[PDB]
Amino acid sequence: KRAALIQNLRDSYTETSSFAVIEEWAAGTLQEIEGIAKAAAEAHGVIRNSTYGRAQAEKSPEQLLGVLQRYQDLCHNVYCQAETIRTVIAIRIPEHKEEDNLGVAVQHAVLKIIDELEIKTLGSGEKSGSGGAPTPIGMYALREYLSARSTVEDKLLGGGSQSPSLLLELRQIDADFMLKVELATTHLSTMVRAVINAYLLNWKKLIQPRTGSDHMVS
Amino acid sequence: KRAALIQNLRDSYTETSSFAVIEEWAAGTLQEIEGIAKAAAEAHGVIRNSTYGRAQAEKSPEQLLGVLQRYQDLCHNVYCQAETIRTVIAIRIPEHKEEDNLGVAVQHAVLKIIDELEIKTLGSGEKSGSGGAPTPIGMYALREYLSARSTVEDKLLGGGSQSPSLLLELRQIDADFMLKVELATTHLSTMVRAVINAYLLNWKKLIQPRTGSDHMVS
Amino acid sequence: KRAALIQNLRDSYTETSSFAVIEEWAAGTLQEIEGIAKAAAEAHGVIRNSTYGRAQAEKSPEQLLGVLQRYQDLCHNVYCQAETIRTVIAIRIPEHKEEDNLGVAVQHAVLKIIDELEIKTLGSGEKSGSGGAPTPIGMYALREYLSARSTVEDKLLGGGSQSPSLLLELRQIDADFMLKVELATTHLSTMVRAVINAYLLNWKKLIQPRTGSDHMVS
Amino acid sequence: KRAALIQNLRDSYTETSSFAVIEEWAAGTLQEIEGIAKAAAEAHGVIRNSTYGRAQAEKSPEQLLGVLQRYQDLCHNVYCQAETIRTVIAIRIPEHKEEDNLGVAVQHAVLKIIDELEIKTLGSGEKSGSGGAPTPIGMYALREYLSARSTVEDKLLGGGSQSPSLLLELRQIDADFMLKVELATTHLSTMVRAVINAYLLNWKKLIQPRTGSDHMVS
Amino acid sequence: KRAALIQNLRDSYTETSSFAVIEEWAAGTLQEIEGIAKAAAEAHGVIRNSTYGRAQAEKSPEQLLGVLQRYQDLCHNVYCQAETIRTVIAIRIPEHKEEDNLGVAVQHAVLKIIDELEIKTLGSGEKSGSGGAPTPIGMYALREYLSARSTVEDKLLGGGSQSPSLLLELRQIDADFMLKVELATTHLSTMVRAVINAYLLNWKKLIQPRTGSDHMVS
Amino acid sequence: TVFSPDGRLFQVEYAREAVKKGSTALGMKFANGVLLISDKKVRSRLIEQNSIEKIQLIDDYVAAVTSGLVADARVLVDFARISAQQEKVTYGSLVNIENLVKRVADQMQQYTQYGGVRPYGVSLIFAGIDQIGPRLFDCDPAGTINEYKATAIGSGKDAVVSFLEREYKENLPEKEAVTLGIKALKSSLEEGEELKAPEIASITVGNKYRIYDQEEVKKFL
Amino acid sequence: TVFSPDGRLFQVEYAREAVKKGSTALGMKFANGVLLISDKKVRSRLIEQNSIEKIQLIDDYVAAVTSGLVADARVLVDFARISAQQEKVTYGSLVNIENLVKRVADQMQQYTQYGGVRPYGVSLIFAGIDQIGPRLFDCDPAGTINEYKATAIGSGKDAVVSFLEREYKENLPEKEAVTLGIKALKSSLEEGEELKAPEIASITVGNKYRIYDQEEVKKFL
Amino acid sequence: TVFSPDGRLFQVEYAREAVKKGSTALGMKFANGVLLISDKKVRSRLIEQNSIEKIQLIDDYVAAVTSGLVADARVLVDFARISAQQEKVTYGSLVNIENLVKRVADQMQQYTQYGGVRPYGVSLIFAGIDQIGPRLFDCDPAGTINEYKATAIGSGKDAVVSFLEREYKENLPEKEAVTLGIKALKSSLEEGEELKAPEIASITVGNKYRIYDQEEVKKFL
Amino acid sequence: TVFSPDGRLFQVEYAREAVKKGSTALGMKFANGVLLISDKKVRSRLIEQNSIEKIQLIDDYVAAVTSGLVADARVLVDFARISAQQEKVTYGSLVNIENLVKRVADQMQQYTQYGGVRPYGVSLIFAGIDQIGPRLFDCDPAGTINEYKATAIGSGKDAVVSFLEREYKENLPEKEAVTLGIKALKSSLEEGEELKAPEIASITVGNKYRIYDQEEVKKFL
């Protein structure tokens, strides 16, 4: 039975499922994001005050790896949570029509900003579109950092390079990756707050985009 | 409870939070930008009056590094301040409707200019879009400079290159990076002034995009 | 006081500030451009008459460096002067409305041609857009020239290359960069003349895009 | 004085300046292009009837260099002449309005086809846009030719390559550059003839896009 | 005199000039294309039936070179014939107006399909646009083939690569270039036929896009 | 006002949105009678309380309440008054109230079919006594009519109808009917919001309408 | 003028924006009477003052003050004057001012429902004495009416109404009422501002209207 | 002509742009009198100067000058002339010129409210003598009226008005009023433009209008 | 026909473009008289030239010549002929030709203000003798009128007007006025082109119109 299949979907992902995400985002998530930003700022100050030599090429800084790992773990959680909201809305997009689409337009508008969150803000895709990648750093933060650092390490370690700027570039990678976490957490917090507002103002039409009342006909 | 969640967002990021940014931008920020521009111009004059030999490849010029660091520090602050303004507006975008959107248009208009500031003017993203990178230099200026300089340094220092143009290029990298800071500070100051004016002219609709007064019905 | 903040901005960049730029453009700027184009043309004629060997890979021609430097200096001045005009207009864009936009359209149109000057004609950005780079040479022409020549020099100097076309390519780089200055100065002159005309025809609405005369009421 | 500044511009570039370009284009220019096409065609004929060996890699063929130089010189002149017409039109674009723009549309239309000539047909920009490079060769074809040939020369001359097809590709570079001149000359002549027609049909509105005659009011 | 310059233009490229091309395309051109297709298939059959070893890297196959050369000559001719039609139309595009453009629309529509023939079908440009290169092989197919083969030859000849797929790739390059000629000739014949039809149905408006009869006024 | 592909008149549906913004009003039939109760937005001590009533007498035996655009509603009440007088002059009496309601509804329907005019943004309840008995009708922007034992209009319509659908009994004494009506109306009010002296009017067979004075209403609060 | 999906008439809401731009005026009831006060956008000694009349007599017992599009307002005042005369000829007097205000409001309502016309960009306050007593009404572009003890129209409406909401009391002596009114109007002015001489008119039961002369107005400033 | 979201009628504002292109004209009151002066864009020795005058008598006691669309202006002057005669036939005289100006203004107001027509692109000054005294009014495309001691219309309005705000004195002798008027008009001319001979008309209480001939106007140049 | 933001009526300006395409015609006053000359677009030897004349008698004392849409022009000439007869029946004569011209111009003005019609694409020159003397007027698609000593309409207007501004003298004898007019018309044919026999008509005070025949016109060529 076709109605049964639709009802099973909708019973499995209800307004409660999406509201629970929003509740968690408004509390613990924003607080965790702020925590990551402060840890990044602390690591950034430490690097700013450091003089680098060849020994800095011989070890990957644990403090920075920890900050990047925490950022990646949070982004993983937010992505999965955003998919829950997406699912709740997308399984309630109604029969396709050329009329009575005021609530459908609300559904598409909120899905658009959740897509922006997942794709642009979190940088979760394999490749960025023609729009580029507006987030300072994307989800796969550790890989990005390790890739950039490893290249400079190989050049410095070997005879190792004698370029003075290349050694400063090693320090700058360390500094810039913490800066990028600081900027990205800030940008993400804006997005998460914007989604909380959009969801809570629009949720009635997100769940029930069309309201029945054929009072004109008998 | 839903209204409480929305009220907590809006209480946390108020018109006073955004106005406080604009006040800072109008005074201290523009002053710091001016200061950096002067420091870049001074550094540029010093390089213009120099002859380069292989010794210039053995040391990274600390005066240039300081100018670039100061610019990056300023960009970081402006980025985070911009996000405060973005948040104040974004959490007050009202219920999605096909009517009564004149104030919503104002919100989108000011968000668009703040987006241009953060993405294009500050060059804060991981990758620029199809529209290119119109700012002479972005946030990660130091990294850009060190990467460009190290390449030439490695070539000059080795089997060190005997190309006469390669040596002049080392100088031109030093010169151009200072020029780019002079140009970018100018360009940035224009955007910041434009945003001050846009905010102060539009702030009532940014905060309250819809005004109630349904007198027609009883 | 918000009005005061706006007034301070507008008092610091007045129509006099932008008019002073246009006056300089109409006179000294176009004259300097002309002088650069003549200098580029003499250098090109000298190179056309030249036969090239290994000695030409051993020295970077100072006459060409001088032409390119002069061109960069001019571009720098024009950029910064353009930003003054941009500032004068942008801080007078009025409250966002869906009506009474005939003067606002004037402000946007003149801002658009100043943006084209800065971004496209001067090539001031760090990456050109999907539109490409229509100007024959941009702001960082000297670095462009040094980069291209250094590559060919290293190849010729070494066991040096035995390619006869590589040696003619060295000459052609020298020739083409001078041709590019001749072309770019011409192109730039047209744009500057177009902006002088546009500013002087539209300045009243640029400063005062809306005129209050609410005579229908009381 | 503002009116004087505009009059000085318009006095320096008049309809005579642009008509003089058009007269020259209709006569000497088209003849010079025809001459280049025939010089290209005969040089192509020579290469076709040639068998290439290692010797052909040891000298760059002077006849082909001369054809390409000639084409470049012609492109240079056409570019500078096109900018004269652009100047004549652009300094007569009138006050920005939302009405009375029928003549303004003529100005923009003719400017568009002259921009196509300069950017696309002549390939004068440093980078082509997303529209690609539709012209068979551009303004820097000599440099294009020398680069391409130099790569293949180096591979052939050395421990020089034993590839039979590499030798044939040396010939094909020679042949194809001549063919490209034959094609580009044809393409350029079409565009030149199209601009002669457009200019002569539209020149009155190009100079005077608005005609006064306010008879309705007193 | 202006009218005389236009008349000389139109007298030199008349409807007869364009009709003569269409007559040639309808007859000999399609027959030559058909000839190339057959010769390509024949060569393809020969390669399909061949086992390749190192010996095939030591010589470039004259039969395939002949087919590719014949295609290039045909494309060269078609390109120049298309430019004749282009010219006949472009020099009769009338005074730019905002009305009486039904004929002008016909001119732009036929110019569009001739442009597609020259740029896309024949692949005549130096760089393809964002629309890619939809033709199986373009005008510089001989250079494409030699390039591709010479890379593989060098790897095979060295000591030589022991890659089994590299050896089969040599055969595949030979086969695929003949296949591409078979496909491109087919695709070209479709375009040519489409243009014959479009010209012969539309020629009256191509020559005379506007028709006078202002009987309404006296 | 034209048809959508699905056969809807959206301009009429939108008129119905104006109606939902109005103050809640209800009617119910009881033993040998019918009554109306109307909630009011009174927002300012500077307003004259006693004026611009929600319950409007059409004649001595028929009353109306409305919800929606108040100026539109005034026009329709004026129309209903004049139409009732025309019937009385023609025949000497108004035998069946349904026919007056139909005339008003026909005026509304016309403004959904002809171009050059927008629909009235009004719903009405009519209540009175005629030769058939006590009558209670509603009428919406489309000119759709229904006859009822009890009904409501305005923002609180749904809650009031829900309440009456479970609590309403036919043929109650007037006092018990009013009590029930007040209770239903209170059920539609938001959490912690209390009811500020509604309008009440009733009529019983053989009598003319009575409007409840301020003091009689309070006795039910 | 058609309905939006939320049931709104935006063209009427826009007409209401025109009214917000008009000069500030107020009315208030006092012991056995009613008064009107109007501020005036007087700018230029070249203007004739005597010819300015923001307070317009409708008849000897009824006056109006308007805000918004001035030419529209003149048309509605002319309409009200003729309508008042037609009633007086028909019945011999005007028993209840509310009926006149309703006819003016019905004219305005019509221009919000029929195509081919725009609404009037006007709000009016009517004040006078009829058989009920002293009356004070306002009327807006929709043709919505309300009766008030005190009210205001024009750009300073919100400030004046807030002031009166706090400070108004019923049955003041005329002098005290006028004093209150002046203070209310003064409160609506911006940073460091008079307040030139406004127009004042009052009427008490059993008398005709009086217009305060420039010199009697000065006493309150 | 409909309302923008800010409550503006852009088609009326645009009509006011047409008025700004017209030749400058002014009026001023003086001791027991009123005068009009009009500049003219005389453009060819081939024109008859004495014809299609800017100052037009409405009757012996009332004259008008206009600025804006000249054909529209003629229609409105024709209307004004006929409306004056209707009033004279009905009552025997025209007691108050303001009522005539209002009738013209109402005609203009109508063309801003009804679809199917555009507004008149005209401003007018009316000046004359009635039972109240010397009168001076202006009227704009909206039908907005003001009464003045001195005023101006057309391209040079702002300069003329600024000049008068400083220099105008009441109760001047005619000759001194004319001199001041000429001075005011000159103050509005662009860099070294010369006033070549305006029209002048004046009226004093108890007399009919006087139109100055060219030779008398010259004595003021 | 509505206003652009700059206060222009583009539909009227466009109608004026149709007039610019018409054949050149001119009028001039001379010693005790006025004349009209019209060029014609002779566009086939198969046309009867003696028919559908550019110069049209309105009555014995007044003629017109037109440029622009020929069917529109015929309608206006028909209107002018009937309007002249109406005046003659009402008063016994036509005292001032200006009033006839104004009636025609008013008809044209109306078609620039009312929706559902387009303007007439016509300019006219009227010339004749009335009680004032010899008169020469023009009238354009807006209904704008001017009186002239000499004027022209049609494609050659600017050249003919330039010529006359330099060469025109008042009070020439008829033969000399005609010579001048022929010479003026010839100068508007810029390239080496021949003037075919134009239409010529003239009138002097005390006489009726006369139309120059084929041979008398030739005497000036």
Give CA–CA dist I17/I13, Å, rounded. 7
H50, H197 Cβ separation under 8 angstroms: no
CA quadruple A80, A84, A85, A88: dihedral, nearest 10: 160
Q: Do C125 and B134 touch (CB under 8 A)?
A: yes
H150 beta partners: H28
Put simply, the chain C residues between 162 and 201 with a CB less than 8 A from any chain H CB are: none
Give CA–CA dist C40/C35, Å, rounded. 9
Q: Do G71 and H165 touch (CB under 8 A)?
A: no
E strand or H helix at E64: helix E62-90
Give CA–CA dist B60/B66, Å, rounded. 11
B72, B141 Cβ separation under 8 angstroms: yes
Q: Is the dihedral of CA B18, B24, B27, B31 positive or negative?
A: negative
Nearest 5 degrees, angle CA I134-CA I135-CA I136?
135
* Token representation of residue G139: 């009327």
Could you check whether the bond before residue G195 is cis, i.e. omega within 30 degrees of 0?
Answer: yes
Give CA–CA dist C138/C131, Å, rounded. 15
Q: Closest to B130 (Cβ–Cβ): which among C72, C125, C130?
A: C130
CA quadruple I10, I13, I18, I21: dihedral, nearest 10: -140
Q: Do F8 and A215 touch (CB under 8 A)?
A: no
Strands (E), I163-215: 199-204, 210-211
Give CA–CA dist G140/G154, Å, rounded. 11
Q: Do B217 and F18 touch (CB under 8 A)?
A: yes
Judging by beta carbons within 10 Å of its beta carbon (0-12, 13-18, 19+), is residue E82 exposed, middle or buried? buried
I134-139 and I122-129 beta bridge pairing: antiparallel
Q: What is the CB neighbour count within 10 angstroms for residue E31? A: 9
- Which chain B positions have a beta carbon within 8 Å of F54's beta carbon? 218
D52, D170 Cβ separation under 8 angstroms: yes
Nearest-Cα distance to chain F for B214, in Å, is: 9
Domains in chain E: ranges and CATH: 1-208 (1.20.120.180)
Give CA–CA dist G153/G66, Å, rounded. 8
Give CA–CA dist D164/E61, Å, rounded. 10
Give CA–CA dist G71/H117, Å, rounded. 17
H145 beta partners: H139
Q: Cβ of G22 under 8 Å from any chain C Cβ? A: yes
* Structure-solving method: X-ray
CA quadruple A195, A198, A200, A206: dihedral, nearest 10: -110
Closest CA to F133 of F169, F108, F97: F97
- I146 to chain H: nearest residue by CA? H52
Q: In what order do the strands lie in the sheet with H150-153?
A: H150-153, H25-30, H33-38, H199-204, H210-211
G37 beta partners: G26, G200
Put simply, the chain F residues between 65 and 84 with a CB less than 8 A from any chain B CB are: 67-71, 73
Nearest-Cα distance to chain H for C99, in Å, is: 7
Give CA–CA dist E44/E37, Å, rounded. 10
Nearest 5 degrees, angle CA F139-CA F141-CA F147?
15
* Token representation of residue I68: 């622009």
I127 beta partners: I63, I136
HEC string for chain A: CHHHHHHHHHHHCCHHHHHHHHHHHHHHHHHHHHHHHHHHHHHHHHHHCCCCCHHHHHCCCHHHHHHHHHHHHHHHHHHHHHHHHHHHHHCCCCCCCCCCCHHHHHHHHHHHHHHHHHHHHCCCCCCCCCCCECCCCCCCHHHHHHHHHHHHHHHHHCCCCCCHHHHHHHHHHHHHHHHHHHHHHHHHHHHHHHHHHHHHHHHHHHHCCCCCCCCCCC
* Residue with the two structure tokens 């003219």: H40
Instruction: Give the contacts of H58 (CB within 8 A, at least 6 positions apart).
Output: H64, H77, H80, H81, H84, H100, H126, H128
Give CA–CA dist F145/F132, Å, rounded. 17
Q: In what order do the strands lie in the sheet with G33-38?
A: G150-153, G25-30, G33-38, G199-204, G210-211
Resolution value (Å, 1 decimal): 1.9
Max distance between CA atoms of chain D, in angstroms, equals 91
* Residue with the two structure tokens 């009766």: G147
Residue C197 DSSP label? H
- Which chain G positions have a beta carbon within 8 Å of B213's beta carbon? 16
Touch of F by C (3+ CB pairs closer than 8 Å): no
Give CA–CA dist I60/I94, Å, rounded. 11
Q: What is the CB neighbour count within 10 angstroms for residue I49? A: 13
Q: Closest to H117 (Cβ–Cβ): which among I114, I142, I146?
A: I114
* Token representation of residue H80: 């004004």
Q: How far apart are the first and last CA of chain E?
A: 30
Q: What CATH class is the domain F1-221?
A: alpha beta
Give CA–CA dist C86/C119, Å, rounded. 13
* Residue with the two structure tokens 């060098």: E154
Closest CA to B90 of H158, A142, A193, H13: A193
- Exposure string of C78-112, with b = 16+ CB inside 10 Å and e = fewer, is bbbbbbebbbbbbbbbbebbeebbbbbebbeebbe
Give CA–CA dist H51/I149, Å, rounded. 11
Q: Do B99 and G140 touch (CB under 8 A)?
A: no
Put simply, the chain B residues between 67 and 126 with a CB less than 8 A from any chain C CB are: 102, 105-106, 109-110, 123
Helices (H) and strands (E) in chain I, counts: 6, 10
Put simply, the chain I residues between 45 and 64 with a CB less than 8 A from any chain D CB are: none
